[PDB]
């Protein structure tokens, strides 16, 4: 049932927008495309919003 | 019935289990074989992190299934380090790690000596002898690495 990018190292399926594997730290495959239709959970949305906050400052 | 647990380090562990065994029981069997404390074990199947109170049957894990094992520090967390080349590295750290400790981990990935690394967070260059905890750097925080290049 998970949705996202499979880490080819450990097979954990990661949130599309996470840059590295939540389990084993391996980097997201460069070929995976974040879907435009992905709707992140509140924690991940807030994380990204934080990053977006930093840029404007 | 038999199930197999594949580690990152290549190795495959063979276990004897029943569909009714809990994830906890499985981790205990891995500890019996490999010495690994269950609190350091992350088991993965069908792309999911398995929860301790569930059973193999709960996850529809059948005879001769392969589970993947990743080891993680009991009190650890991850942070991201973004480089000016756009590479993002993901590191396992703990609140107690000093910036110097973090640099040592970056050197493993980037091959850059700590004395040539600067880390920026929240607009501020971080100081070597202070901890992530001191800076209120929490799980999934992004730090920015800048290289000090001679000349
Ligand atoms: Zn992984």
XYZ file of N, CA, C and O and ligand atoms in Angstrom:
833
model
N 0.773 -1.239 0.000
C 0.000 0.000 0.000
C 0.815 1.306 0.000
O 0.268 2.363 -0.309
N 2.112 1.252 0.361
C 2.840 2.527 0.378
C 2.914 3.179 -1.000
O 2.919 2.495 -2.026
N 2.977 4.504 -1.007
C 3.113 5.269 -2.234
C 4.387 6.101 -2.159
O 4.635 6.756 -1.148
N 5.194 6.058 -3.220
C 6.426 6.828 -3.280
C 7.554 6.143 -4.038
O 7.311 5.315 -4.922
N 8.792 6.501 -3.698
C 9.956 5.900 -4.322
C 10.539 4.772 -3.500
O 10.859 4.950 -2.335
N 10.656 3.602 -4.116
C 11.311 2.491 -3.455
C 12.804 2.741 -3.363
O 13.461 3.042 -4.364
N 13.354 2.613 -2.162
C 14.798 2.635 -2.025
C 15.318 1.325 -2.609
O 14.930 0.273 -2.146
N 16.187 1.381 -3.633
C 16.638 0.111 -4.211
C 17.578 -0.614 -3.261
O 17.864 -1.788 -3.473
N 18.055 0.085 -2.233
C 18.949 -0.520 -1.258
C 18.245 -1.421 -0.251
O 18.679 -2.554 -0.034
N 17.163 -0.923 0.359
C 16.481 -1.640 1.446
C 15.033 -2.018 1.125
O 14.391 -2.748 1.889
N 14.543 -1.520 -0.012
C 13.180 -1.727 -0.508
C 12.078 -0.957 0.232
O 10.892 -1.161 -0.055
N 12.454 -0.104 1.185
C 11.476 0.757 1.853
C 10.915 1.711 0.812
O 11.651 2.196 -0.050
N 9.622 1.996 0.901
C 8.984 2.942 -0.022
C 8.818 4.317 0.639
O 8.087 4.459 1.618
N 9.493 5.317 0.080
C 9.637 6.654 0.673
C 8.646 7.682 0.146
O 8.147 7.558 -0.975
N 8.373 8.709 0.947
C 7.561 9.825 0.473
C 8.242 10.420 -0.756
O 9.461 10.599 -0.772
N 7.462 10.699 -1.810
C 8.038 11.188 -3.068
C 9.015 12.329 -2.877
O 10.044 12.370 -3.561
N 8.705 13.250 -1.961
C 9.510 14.455 -1.810
C 10.713 14.328 -0.863
O 11.460 15.283 -0.694
N 10.904 13.173 -0.238
C 12.059 12.996 0.649
C 13.317 12.715 -0.177
O 13.298 11.823 -1.037
N 14.410 13.471 0.074
C 15.646 13.416 -0.724
C 16.482 12.152 -0.500
O 17.373 11.864 -1.303
N 16.213 11.438 0.587
C 16.992 10.270 0.976
C 16.130 9.272 1.749
O 15.104 9.641 2.308
N 16.554 8.012 1.787
C 15.720 6.928 2.308
C 15.532 7.030 3.814
O 16.501 7.154 4.574
N 14.273 6.995 4.234
C 13.933 7.139 5.651
C 14.548 6.020 6.489
O 14.816 6.210 7.672
N 14.783 4.864 5.870
C 15.354 3.720 6.587
C 16.881 3.698 6.574
O 17.515 3.573 7.626
N 17.470 3.820 5.389
C 18.900 3.542 5.234
C 19.760 4.707 4.727
O 20.964 4.535 4.501
N 19.152 5.880 4.546
C 19.893 7.086 4.161
C 20.293 7.154 2.667
O 20.850 8.161 2.210
N 20.033 6.096 1.904
C 20.430 6.115 0.490
C 19.680 7.213 -0.279
O 18.514 7.461 -0.020
N 20.351 7.866 -1.221
C 19.753 8.999 -1.936
C 18.592 8.555 -2.829
O 18.584 7.435 -3.324
N 17.606 9.426 -3.024
C 16.501 9.115 -3.939
C 17.041 8.896 -5.359
O 17.930 9.612 -5.790
N 16.519 7.892 -6.084
C 16.967 7.697 -7.473
C 16.738 8.970 -8.270
O 15.683 9.578 -8.147
N 17.724 9.372 -9.065
C 17.627 10.582 -9.858
C 16.531 10.471 -10.925
O 16.006 11.483 -11.390
N 16.193 9.243 -11.310
C 15.189 9.020 -12.354
C 13.738 9.085 -11.854
O 12.806 9.178 -12.644
N 13.540 9.045 -10.546
C 12.179 9.110 -10.026
C 11.660 10.546 -10.123
O 12.370 11.495 -9.776
N 10.435 10.697 -10.624
C 9.801 12.008 -10.761
C 8.717 12.165 -9.723
O 7.794 11.345 -9.654
N 8.813 13.210 -8.910
C 7.747 13.489 -7.953
C 6.459 13.766 -8.725
O 6.444 14.623 -9.601
N 5.368 13.039 -8.413
C 4.149 13.318 -9.193
C 3.553 14.689 -8.878
O 3.502 15.038 -7.705
N 3.098 15.433 -9.891
C 2.428 16.712 -9.646
C 1.189 16.538 -8.753
O 0.734 17.502 -8.128
N 0.638 15.323 -8.727
C -0.623 15.051 -8.024
C -0.404 14.509 -6.608
O -1.360 14.210 -5.896
N 0.855 14.381 -6.201
C 1.166 13.964 -4.834
C 0.667 14.994 -3.819
O 0.904 16.183 -3.970
N -0.019 14.528 -2.784
C -0.534 15.410 -1.743
C 0.108 14.989 -0.416
O -0.284 14.000 0.184
N 1.138 15.722 0.023
C 1.903 15.245 1.182
C 1.100 15.302 2.478
O 0.249 16.177 2.641
N 1.376 14.365 3.382
C 0.772 14.359 4.711
C 1.158 15.652 5.425
O 2.049 16.374 4.974
N 0.522 15.945 6.551
C 0.750 17.249 7.165
C 2.193 17.461 7.611
O 2.730 18.556 7.474
N 2.833 16.418 8.124
C 4.209 16.561 8.591
C 5.173 16.873 7.433
O 6.062 17.724 7.547
N 5.005 16.182 6.316
C 5.881 16.411 5.180
C 5.551 17.766 4.540
O 6.445 18.510 4.142
N 4.269 18.107 4.474
C 3.891 19.417 3.962
C 4.557 20.509 4.799
O 5.143 21.446 4.251
N 4.477 20.384 6.126
C 5.104 21.363 7.017
C 6.629 21.397 6.849
O 7.242 22.473 6.895
N 7.244 20.235 6.622
C 8.688 20.206 6.389
C 9.026 21.024 5.149
O 9.885 21.908 5.192
N 8.341 20.739 4.045
C 8.593 21.467 2.800
C 8.304 22.953 2.969
O 9.039 23.804 2.458
N 7.231 23.266 3.684
C 6.868 24.658 3.915
C 7.992 25.360 4.674
O 8.227 26.549 4.485
N 8.681 24.616 5.537
C 9.793 25.168 6.298
C 10.942 25.522 5.371
O 11.505 26.609 5.438
N 11.269 24.595 4.476
C 12.297 24.838 3.473
C 11.921 26.059 2.643
O 12.756 26.917 2.390
N 10.651 26.145 2.241
C 10.201 27.277 1.433
C 10.313 28.583 2.211
O 10.585 29.633 1.633
N 10.098 28.509 3.522
C 10.239 29.673 4.390
C 11.674 30.190 4.361
O 11.906 31.396 4.254
N 12.635 29.273 4.444
C 14.047 29.648 4.455
C 14.454 30.447 3.210
O 15.133 31.466 3.319
N 14.038 29.990 2.030
C 14.416 30.665 0.782
C 14.045 32.144 0.741
O 14.812 32.963 0.236
N 12.862 32.480 1.246
C 12.359 33.846 1.143
C 13.089 34.792 2.090
O 12.987 36.015 1.965
N 13.835 34.219 3.027
C 14.576 35.014 3.996
C 16.034 35.212 3.580
O 16.523 36.341 3.524
N 7.439 -22.675 9.882
C 7.778 -22.316 8.510
C 9.050 -21.478 8.515
O 9.427 -20.928 9.548
N 9.720 -21.399 7.368
C 10.945 -20.622 7.251
C 10.689 -19.272 6.609
O 9.886 -19.162 5.686
N 11.361 -18.248 7.118
C 11.450 -16.968 6.418
C 12.908 -16.510 6.353
O 13.758 -16.973 7.131
N 13.212 -15.614 5.419
C 14.589 -15.153 5.244
C 14.690 -13.654 5.481
O 13.811 -12.888 5.076
N 15.755 -13.247 6.160
C 16.002 -11.834 6.445
C 17.302 -11.397 5.792
O 18.384 -11.893 6.138
N 17.193 -10.477 4.836
C 18.344 -10.012 4.083
C 18.867 -8.716 4.682
O 18.117 -7.767 4.907
N 20.165 -8.672 4.936
C 20.749 -7.474 5.496
C 21.338 -6.639 4.360
O 21.447 -7.111 3.230
N 21.705 -5.395 4.649
C 22.332 -4.557 3.629
C 23.711 -5.143 3.331
O 24.090 -5.310 2.169
N 24.432 -5.473 4.403
C 25.754 -6.107 4.348
C 25.761 -7.400 3.528
O 26.683 -8.199 3.639
N 24.727 -7.608 2.719
C 24.629 -8.795 1.889
C 23.944 -9.987 2.546
O 23.017 -10.561 1.977
N 24.397 -10.340 3.748
C 24.002 -11.571 4.446
C 22.506 -11.898 4.541
O 21.663 -11.017 4.721
N 22.197 -13.189 4.455
C 20.830 -13.667 4.606
C 20.675 -14.566 5.828
O 21.398 -15.545 5.992
N 19.715 -14.213 6.677
C 19.448 -14.929 7.915
C 18.224 -15.803 7.743
O 17.183 -15.340 7.278
N 18.335 -17.065 8.128
C 17.201 -17.969 8.011
C 16.530 -18.170 9.362
O 17.187 -18.522 10.348
N 15.224 -17.944 9.411
C 14.489 -18.078 10.672
C 13.374 -19.094 10.572
O 12.796 -19.302 9.497
N 13.068 -19.695 11.720
C 11.942 -20.598 11.882
C 10.866 -19.853 12.669
O 11.116 -19.369 13.780
N 9.682 -19.737 12.077
C 8.624 -18.893 12.636
C 7.249 -19.512 12.404
O 7.121 -20.493 11.668
N 6.230 -18.945 13.047
C 4.843 -19.275 12.744
C 4.141 -17.996 12.295
O 4.507 -16.909 12.732
N 3.126 -18.116 11.426
C 2.427 -16.909 10.966
C 1.958 -16.027 12.127
O 1.843 -14.814 11.965
N 1.706 -16.638 13.284
C 1.248 -15.910 14.461
C 2.336 -15.145 15.220
O 2.021 -14.403 16.148
N 3.605 -15.350 14.870
C 4.696 -14.646 15.546
C 4.594 -13.140 15.356
O 4.299 -12.664 14.260
N 4.852 -12.388 16.419
C 4.844 -10.934 16.315
C 6.170 -10.444 15.747
O 7.178 -11.164 15.766
N 6.166 -9.225 15.221
C 7.400 -8.629 14.730
C 8.456 -8.649 15.843
O 9.645 -8.907 15.585
N 8.011 -8.406 17.077
C 8.894 -8.456 18.231
C 9.559 -9.818 18.357
O 10.754 -9.888 18.629
N 8.775 -10.891 18.194
C 9.301 -12.248 18.295
C 10.336 -12.476 17.212
O 11.383 -13.080 17.448
N 10.031 -12.001 16.011
C 10.964 -12.144 14.915
C 12.284 -11.432 15.225
O 13.354 -11.995 15.008
N 12.212 -10.214 15.760
C 13.438 -9.477 16.103
C 14.237 -10.196 17.191
O 15.467 -10.158 17.198
N 13.523 -10.860 18.098
C 14.165 -11.637 19.158
C 14.923 -12.831 18.568
O 15.996 -13.190 19.044
N 14.352 -13.442 17.532
C 14.994 -14.559 16.848
C 16.234 -14.074 16.085
O 17.238 -14.783 16.008
N 16.161 -12.868 15.526
C 17.326 -12.262 14.870
C 18.399 -11.953 15.902
O 19.597 -12.181 15.672
N 17.982 -11.435 17.050
C 18.936 -11.207 18.141
C 19.599 -12.510 18.620
O 20.792 -12.541 18.932
N 18.822 -13.580 18.699
C 19.366 -14.873 19.109
C 20.461 -15.343 18.148
O 21.451 -15.934 18.571
N 20.277 -15.078 16.858
C 21.234 -15.529 15.847
C 22.419 -14.583 15.660
O 23.568 -15.019 15.530
N 22.133 -13.286 15.660
C 23.081 -12.289 15.193
C 23.549 -11.324 16.281
O 24.435 -10.517 16.045
N 22.954 -11.396 17.469
C 23.400 -10.554 18.570
C 22.839 -9.140 18.528
O 23.133 -8.333 19.408
N 22.022 -8.849 17.517
C 21.481 -7.499 17.310
C 20.282 -7.209 18.221
O 19.254 -7.881 18.122
N 20.393 -6.189 19.085
C 19.260 -5.838 19.956
C 18.056 -5.429 19.113
O 18.227 -4.697 18.142
N 16.854 -5.917 19.463
C 15.652 -5.610 18.685
C 15.417 -4.113 18.546
O 14.837 -3.707 17.551
N 15.871 -3.306 19.502
C 15.614 -1.861 19.421
C 16.455 -1.157 18.348
O 16.245 0.020 18.051
N 17.396 -1.886 17.764
C 18.215 -1.342 16.698
C 17.807 -1.867 15.331
O 18.440 -1.533 14.334
N 16.766 -2.693 15.293
C 16.369 -3.381 14.063
C 15.167 -2.725 13.412
O 14.150 -2.491 14.067
N 15.273 -2.462 12.114
C 14.130 -2.055 11.331
C 13.892 -3.176 10.323
O 14.781 -3.517 9.548
N 12.707 -3.777 10.361
C 12.375 -4.818 9.393
C 11.428 -4.236 8.366
O 10.540 -3.462 8.713
N 11.622 -4.615 7.110
C 10.875 -4.030 6.001
C 10.292 -5.128 5.132
O 10.991 -6.081 4.805
N 9.012 -5.001 4.779
C 8.355 -5.953 3.893
C 7.225 -5.247 3.140
O 6.494 -4.432 3.711
N 7.087 -5.560 1.858
C 6.088 -4.898 1.023
C 6.282 -3.378 1.037
O 5.331 -2.624 0.900
N 7.525 -2.942 1.222
C 7.853 -1.523 1.240
C 7.521 -0.766 2.517
O 7.633 0.465 2.556
N 7.109 -1.492 3.555
C 6.670 -0.884 4.807
C 7.600 -1.244 5.956
O 8.148 -2.340 5.990
N 7.749 -0.325 6.906
C 8.381 -0.633 8.189
C 7.410 -1.405 9.088
O 6.346 -0.893 9.424
N 7.780 -2.617 9.499
C 6.883 -3.474 10.276
C 6.840 -3.059 11.747
O 7.885 -2.823 12.352
N 5.630 -2.982 12.311
C 5.430 -2.579 13.707
C 5.480 -3.769 14.664
O 4.960 -4.840 14.361
N 6.068 -3.551 15.836
C 6.397 -4.625 16.772
C 5.224 -5.480 17.264
O 5.401 -6.675 17.541
N 4.043 -4.872 17.390
C 2.896 -5.550 17.957
C 2.067 -6.337 16.959
O 1.192 -7.088 17.349
N 2.340 -6.157 15.673
C 1.669 -6.905 14.618
C 2.329 -8.275 14.427
O 3.419 -8.523 14.942
N 1.673 -9.151 13.672
C 2.196 -10.491 13.420
C 2.544 -10.646 11.950
O 2.175 -9.809 11.120
N 3.259 -11.716 11.624
C 3.573 -11.990 10.236
C 2.285 -12.099 9.427
O 2.184 -11.538 8.328
N 1.295 -12.804 9.981
C 0.016 -12.968 9.303
C -0.664 -11.626 9.060
O -1.267 -11.423 8.016
N -0.573 -10.714 10.022
C -1.152 -9.386 9.837
C -0.644 -8.755 8.541
O -1.404 -8.105 7.836
N 0.637 -8.953 8.236
C 1.228 -8.392 7.010
C 1.168 -9.322 5.800
O 1.769 -9.032 4.759
N 0.455 -10.431 5.930
C 0.420 -11.429 4.868
C 1.807 -11.897 4.444
O 2.066 -12.115 3.263
N 2.690 -12.040 5.427
C 4.000 -12.626 5.214
C 3.873 -14.150 5.251
O 3.535 -14.726 6.277
N 4.118 -14.797 4.118
C 3.934 -16.239 4.011
C 5.245 -17.002 4.095
O 6.329 -16.406 4.144
N 5.148 -18.327 4.101
C 6.343 -19.154 4.152
C 7.337 -18.733 3.063
O 6.947 -18.383 1.938
N 8.617 -18.746 3.426
C 9.727 -18.422 2.529
C 9.756 -16.996 1.982
O 10.406 -16.733 0.972
N 9.059 -16.084 2.652
C 9.166 -14.664 2.342
C 10.549 -14.146 2.741
O 11.195 -14.692 3.645
N 10.998 -13.094 2.056
C 12.219 -12.392 2.430
C 11.837 -11.065 3.066
O 11.069 -10.290 2.481
N 12.362 -10.812 4.262
C 12.276 -9.493 4.883
C 13.624 -8.802 4.760
O 14.671 -9.463 4.724
N 13.609 -7.474 4.714
C 14.860 -6.715 4.664
C 15.101 -6.062 6.016
O 14.194 -5.486 6.600
N 16.331 -6.183 6.494
C 16.747 -5.649 7.780
C 17.702 -4.460 7.601
O 18.721 -4.566 6.909
N 17.360 -3.327 8.216
C 18.247 -2.169 8.276
C 18.487 -1.861 9.743
O 17.541 -1.878 10.541
N 19.740 -1.578 10.107
C 20.052 -1.264 11.508
C 20.079 0.238 11.742
O 20.631 0.995 10.945
N 19.484 0.672 12.843
C 19.452 2.090 13.151
C 19.723 2.321 14.642
O 19.377 1.499 15.479
N 20.384 3.425 14.953
C 20.690 3.769 16.342
C 19.415 4.016 17.119
O 18.495 4.689 16.638
N 19.389 3.479 18.334
C 18.240 3.548 19.222
C 17.714 4.972 19.378
O 16.508 5.202 19.279
N 18.608 5.927 19.615
C 18.175 7.301 19.815
C 18.443 8.218 18.632
O 18.451 9.440 18.772
N 18.645 7.631 17.458
C 19.095 8.403 16.318
C 17.963 9.093 15.585
O 16.777 8.877 15.885
N 18.339 9.923 14.621
C 17.393 10.572 13.717
C 18.155 10.887 12.448
O 19.376 10.764 12.406
N 17.440 11.332 11.422
C 18.097 11.758 10.200
C 18.061 13.262 10.012
O 17.092 13.907 10.403
N 19.120 13.805 9.399
C 19.092 15.169 8.873
C 19.542 15.146 7.415
O 20.156 14.183 6.971
N 19.231 16.205 6.670
C 19.713 16.335 5.302
C 20.763 17.425 5.234
O 20.661 18.452 5.905
N 21.789 17.191 4.432
C 22.809 18.205 4.197
C 22.786 18.520 2.719
O 23.073 17.661 1.881
N 22.395 19.738 2.398
C 22.281 20.143 1.012
C 23.606 20.802 0.592
O 24.129 21.660 1.309
N 24.178 20.381 -0.534
C 25.421 21.002 -1.019
C 25.118 22.014 -2.109
O 24.056 21.962 -2.732
N 26.059 22.918 -2.368
C 25.895 23.871 -3.467
C 25.919 23.220 -4.852
O 25.606 23.872 -5.846
N 26.258 21.935 -4.920
C 26.166 21.199 -6.179
C 24.785 20.568 -6.323
O 24.459 19.988 -7.356
N 23.967 20.684 -5.283
C 22.599 20.202 -5.353
C 22.467 18.775 -4.880
O 21.348 18.256 -4.724
N 23.602 18.122 -4.654
C 23.561 16.816 -4.004
C 22.971 16.995 -2.602
O 23.390 17.876 -1.866
N 21.995 16.174 -2.239
C 21.530 16.128 -0.850
C 21.996 14.845 -0.208
O 21.681 13.756 -0.683
N 22.748 14.952 0.878
C 23.138 13.738 1.577
C 22.291 13.558 2.828
O 21.915 14.532 3.486
N 21.950 12.313 3.128
C 21.100 12.033 4.281
C 21.988 11.338 5.293
O 22.714 10.402 4.952
N 21.968 11.831 6.519
C 22.840 11.299 7.558
C 22.050 10.833 8.769
O 21.027 11.438 9.122
N 22.536 9.769 9.412
C 22.015 9.375 10.709
C 22.860 10.051 11.785
O 24.087 9.889 11.824
N 22.200 10.813 12.646
C 22.876 11.541 13.716
C 22.070 11.408 15.003
O 20.998 10.802 15.018
N 22.583 11.966 16.092
C 21.764 12.085 17.283
C 21.888 13.502 17.826
O 22.791 14.232 17.440
N 20.936 13.911 18.670
C 20.958 15.235 19.300
C 22.317 15.544 19.922
O 22.703 16.709 19.941
N 23.015 14.521 20.423
C 24.294 14.706 21.118
C 25.482 14.991 20.180
O 26.532 15.475 20.622
N 25.325 14.698 18.889
C 26.410 14.942 17.953
C 26.800 16.425 17.866
O 25.941 17.295 17.728
N 28.099 16.694 17.934
C 28.633 18.031 17.695
C 28.684 18.262 16.203
O 28.613 17.320 15.416
N 28.774 19.521 15.803
C 28.928 19.851 14.393
C 30.160 19.149 13.819
O 30.154 18.697 12.676
N 31.207 19.042 14.631
C 32.426 18.357 14.226
C 32.109 16.896 13.914
O 32.593 16.343 12.929
N 31.281 16.275 14.752
C 30.851 14.897 14.521
C 30.131 14.783 13.187
O 30.346 13.837 12.424
N 29.270 15.754 12.906
C 28.503 15.740 11.657
C 29.434 15.883 10.447
O 29.279 15.181 9.441
N 30.420 16.768 10.561
C 31.407 16.948 9.501
C 32.155 15.648 9.198
O 32.440 15.333 8.039
N 32.477 14.894 10.241
C 33.182 13.634 10.052
C 32.345 12.691 9.187
O 32.882 11.973 8.351
N 31.028 12.709 9.376
C 30.143 11.851 8.582
C 30.045 12.335 7.137
O 29.987 11.531 6.202
N 30.033 13.654 6.965
C 30.066 14.270 5.637
C 31.349 13.929 4.881
O 31.328 13.713 3.667
N 32.473 13.888 5.594
C 33.740 13.564 4.966
C 33.696 12.161 4.369
O 34.345 11.887 3.363
N 32.946 11.273 5.003
C 32.835 9.910 4.500
C 32.119 9.888 3.152
O 32.500 9.141 2.251
N 31.089 10.718 3.015
C 30.323 10.797 1.767
C 30.966 11.681 0.684
O 30.941 11.344 -0.495
N 31.540 12.809 1.093
C 32.037 13.819 0.162
C 33.552 13.811 -0.040
O 34.056 14.364 -1.011
N 34.280 13.222 0.902
C 35.728 13.195 0.817
C 36.384 14.531 1.113
O 37.495 14.785 0.673
N 35.680 15.387 1.848
C 36.179 16.712 2.212
C 36.546 16.753 3.700
O 35.726 16.394 4.535
N 37.773 17.192 4.038
C 38.172 17.310 5.447
C 37.271 18.290 6.191
O 36.866 19.300 5.616
N 36.969 18.006 7.466
C 36.093 18.877 8.260
C 36.542 20.347 8.263
O 35.703 21.251 8.212
N 37.849 20.585 8.305
C 38.359 21.955 8.351
C 38.076 22.733 7.063
O 38.198 23.954 7.032
N 37.672 22.029 6.011
C 37.258 22.704 4.786
C 35.739 22.692 4.590
O 35.230 23.105 3.542
N 35.017 22.225 5.600
C 33.560 22.243 5.563
C 33.035 23.376 6.422
O 33.474 23.554 7.561
N 32.090 24.138 5.885
C 31.245 24.983 6.725
C 29.777 24.558 6.646
O 29.265 24.233 5.568
N 29.099 24.546 7.788
C 27.683 24.179 7.804
C 26.848 25.383 8.205
O 27.139 26.047 9.207
N 25.835 25.668 7.395
C 24.925 26.787 7.630
C 23.516 26.266 7.954
O 23.015 25.355 7.293
N 22.884 26.852 8.965
C 21.507 26.507 9.319
C 20.796 27.770 9.760
O 21.306 28.511 10.604
N 19.639 28.027 9.167
C 18.813 29.160 9.582
C 19.571 30.468 9.445
O 19.440 31.368 10.282
N 20.383 30.562 8.396
C 21.098 31.784 8.099
C 22.392 31.960 8.880
O 23.069 32.973 8.714
N 22.749 30.975 9.708
C 23.892 31.103 10.618
C 24.903 29.997 10.376
O 24.525 28.841 10.212
N 26.187 30.345 10.358
C 27.240 29.335 10.246
C 27.392 28.663 11.606
O 27.497 29.338 12.633
N 27.415 27.338 11.609
C 27.432 26.590 12.857
C 28.849 26.424 13.378
O 29.794 26.357 12.602
N 28.987 26.352 14.699
C 30.299 26.224 15.320
C 30.619 24.779 15.733
O 29.770 24.070 16.289
N 31.856 24.368 15.467
C 32.284 22.968 15.572
C 31.961 22.255 16.879
O 31.621 21.070 16.875
N 32.132 22.954 17.995
C 32.068 22.311 19.294
C 30.684 22.247 19.923
O 30.544 21.802 21.056
N 29.665 22.690 19.192
C 28.297 22.692 19.717
C 27.512 21.511 19.157
O 27.854 20.982 18.094
N 26.450 21.114 19.860
C 25.631 19.970 19.443
C 24.409 20.379 18.614
O 23.948 21.527 18.674
N 23.879 19.420 17.860
C 22.615 19.581 17.159
C 21.517 20.006 18.133
O 20.666 20.844 17.819
N 21.564 19.430 19.326
C 20.634 19.748 20.387
C 20.727 21.222 20.780
O 19.699 21.881 20.991
N 21.957 21.713 20.914
C 22.212 23.100 21.283
C 21.556 24.034 20.271
O 21.008 25.068 20.640
N 21.633 23.661 18.995
C 21.094 24.482 17.914
C 19.609 24.241 17.623
O 19.050 24.825 16.687
N 18.980 23.385 18.423
C 17.601 22.941 18.170
C 17.436 22.461 16.736
O 16.531 22.891 16.017
N 18.332 21.581 16.318
C 18.228 20.961 15.008
C 17.552 19.604 15.179
O 18.105 18.702 15.799
N 16.340 19.481 14.640
C 15.502 18.306 14.869
C 15.507 17.354 13.681
O 16.137 17.622 12.657
N 14.780 16.251 13.816
C 14.750 15.246 12.769
C 14.325 15.894 11.451
O 13.465 16.777 11.439
N 14.960 15.477 10.358
C 14.623 15.961 9.010
C 14.900 17.445 8.745
O 14.429 17.999 7.747
N 15.672 18.081 9.627
C 16.212 19.406 9.355
C 17.156 19.345 8.160
O 17.860 18.350 7.966
N 17.186 20.412 7.372
C 18.186 20.527 6.305
C 19.287 21.517 6.657
O 19.008 22.680 6.936
N 20.533 21.047 6.661
C 21.695 21.921 6.792
C 22.303 22.155 5.409
O 22.142 21.332 4.499
N 23.020 23.262 5.257
C 23.690 23.555 3.989
C 25.212 23.547 4.124
O 25.780 24.278 4.941
N 25.855 22.714 3.306
C 27.296 22.560 3.316
C 27.923 23.516 2.312
O 27.532 23.549 1.148
N 28.887 24.300 2.772
C 29.686 25.114 1.873
C 31.156 24.726 2.022
O 31.649 24.521 3.129
N 31.844 24.613 0.892
C 33.238 24.221 0.860
C 34.167 25.425 0.979
O 33.955 26.444 0.342
N 35.199 25.283 1.798
C 36.253 26.272 1.915
C 37.389 25.814 1.002
O 38.143 24.899 1.344
N 37.495 26.423 -0.173
C 38.496 25.995 -1.147
C 39.664 26.965 -1.179
O 39.473 28.176 -1.217
N 40.877 26.432 -1.166
C 42.062 27.283 -1.116
C 42.248 28.162 -2.359
O 41.800 27.820 -3.458
N 42.914 29.302 -2.169
C 43.289 30.170 -3.273
C 42.402 31.387 -3.453
O 42.550 32.119 -4.434
Zn 16.743 2.403 1.967
